């Protein structure tokens with residue numbers, strides 16, 4: 188019953204051959220196999236990985252079911268979306284290497300069969316698959332609720348997750364209203380502290396034409412109305428493309444869709460990877476940076492959200508994007524990432540001229556390496572418990588309380604102290620007695636069911652405490668009062684984990 192690290196992919200390869208729909212994912216795993224095996228052994232030398240119970244794990248890929256009508260496997264090789272497939276590939280690989288008993292499903296039959304057999308201890312699924320899970324199992328689906336880890340790339344804010352509160356605000360999201368512990372949502376980037384950061388691994392194969400730029404956007408429509416911007420870059424640089432077509436100027440050198448090996452070799456010799464503004468928060472820019480390319484990161488002033496961007500309407504968040512790649516912007520920055528308004532011609536020109544004159548190294552944040560990802564997911568599996576069975580994680584010792592000023596969210600105030608909001612600690616900040624510990628003195632108080640509390644008015648020393656524990660929210664600014672915010676430290680380059688969380 189104890190987990191043994193796997194260093195051989197033969198069983199994973201047989202598992203991935205059962206469905207055609209896993210083909211793209213199988214090629215990625217085979218290209219990164221050596222780096223994966225190097226990282227599980229390396230992690231095992233740094234950390235006792237013994238004494239872990241082997242878990243029976245459901246991995247249900249809703250996006251690859253017919254019934255979903257997503258047809259994501261059918262566009263994998265022709266410029267279709269791959270970020271979800273990137274993340275699913277790396278999640279499956281990590282579970283496999285860490286020695287767990289994985290049962291993969293891309294169908295209602297396998298979902299039913301695997302659950303039928305019992306002993307499932309852990310469930311990875313997407314929101315489309317979660318609807319299927321509830322429908323296939325019936326009312327006893329809720330018995331398995333605390334085991335769900337829900338891969339939700341853009342994240343779910345608590346106001347969208349609480350079904351009744353969401354209705355009361357007129358949130359029509361088809362993605363929300365699941366009433367989970369919002370830490371059960373697993374995001375693509377660490378942009379939503381209400382959720383967990385799952386991420387993925389940035390592919391790279393290193394052991395450069397200074398003039399060569401490569402445009403981000405493997406679909407022609409993404410290039411709509413970028414002619415002036417591309418012209419600026421073309422004044423200094425060749426402009427290449429990987430596009431599967433009358434938006435793409437005449438001077439653009441289109442290589443077509445490249446297989447990962449060949450795309451990775453084009454990144455190796457490219458000086459500048461160029462963002463057009465779409466798509467949002469994908470892997471491709473981190474691949475460019477891992478290959479020593481600068482990334483030109485379109486800045487959004489004002490920031491993009493459901494308030495002003497059609498793509499975001501219906502998504503279970505009000506999160507504002509400051510750039511095409513806010514993670515690249517804030518967690519990498521210069522010299523690797525240049526965040527520029529495509530409007531300000533000077534800004535764009537100076538960025539290109541500087542990029543030409545820079546000498547930069549390949550860079551990967553630790554959390555996006557094989558070993559980083561294995562450490563993050565191993566800590567989640569061993570320590571993250573919503574089934575009340577284990578000791579408190581993260582541990583109470585990690586709690587740092589900060590007061591958010593009016594118009595500042597808990598996300599922002601934790602971040603401004605190089606901490607991260609830790610929603611599992613809201614429970615320790617929610618009554619008169621507890622606030623004394625954190626030098627807030629409540630002259631009066633009341634309860635409220637609001638995402639903005641616990642709140643404190645320092646003028647009349649009045650405390651509002653949370654009436655509905657499902658509405659605890661790192662997201663959200665009080666326009667008038669201070670918020671009492673739970674923060675935590677993180678391991679350097681590993682924001683998912685507190686220093687005492689391993």
Ligand SMILES: CC(=O)N[C@H]1[C@H](O[C@@H]2[C@@H](OC[C@H]3O[C@H](O)[C@@H](O)[C@@H](O[C@H]4O[C@H](CO)[C@@H](O)[C@H](O)[C@@H]4O)[C@@H]3O)O[C@H](CO)[C@@H](O)[C@@H]2O)O[C@H](CO)[C@@H](O)[C@@H]1O
Pocket residue numbers: 250256257268271313314315338339340341342362502503
């Ligand atoms: C897989 C998944 O659920 N990903 C996240 C999701 O992202 C959305 C999802 O869209 C799935 C497909 O949904 C419909 O079938 C279409 O909108 C597809 O787009 C294609 O066809 C459209 C017309 O039918 C066309 O408008 C469009 O240009 C495209 O060619 C979608 O593929 O996944 C895609 C791809 O990344 C994404 O763009 C969608 O936003 O959002 C969820 C909520 O944020 C999140 O939980 C989930 O991880």
Ligand SMILES: O=c1ccn([C@@H]2O[C@H](COP(=O)(O)OP(=O)(O)O)[C@@H](O)[C@H]2O)c(=O)[nH]1
Pocket residue numbers: 267268269270271273405429430443444445446447450466468469470471472474
């Ligand atoms: O010609 C190409 C261009 C991109 N990619 C891959 O497409 C993946 C997804 O990158 P992107 O940021 O475009 O995410 P998406 O929008 O596809 O989810 C990355 O791993 C790239 O390596 C590819 O295989 N061939």
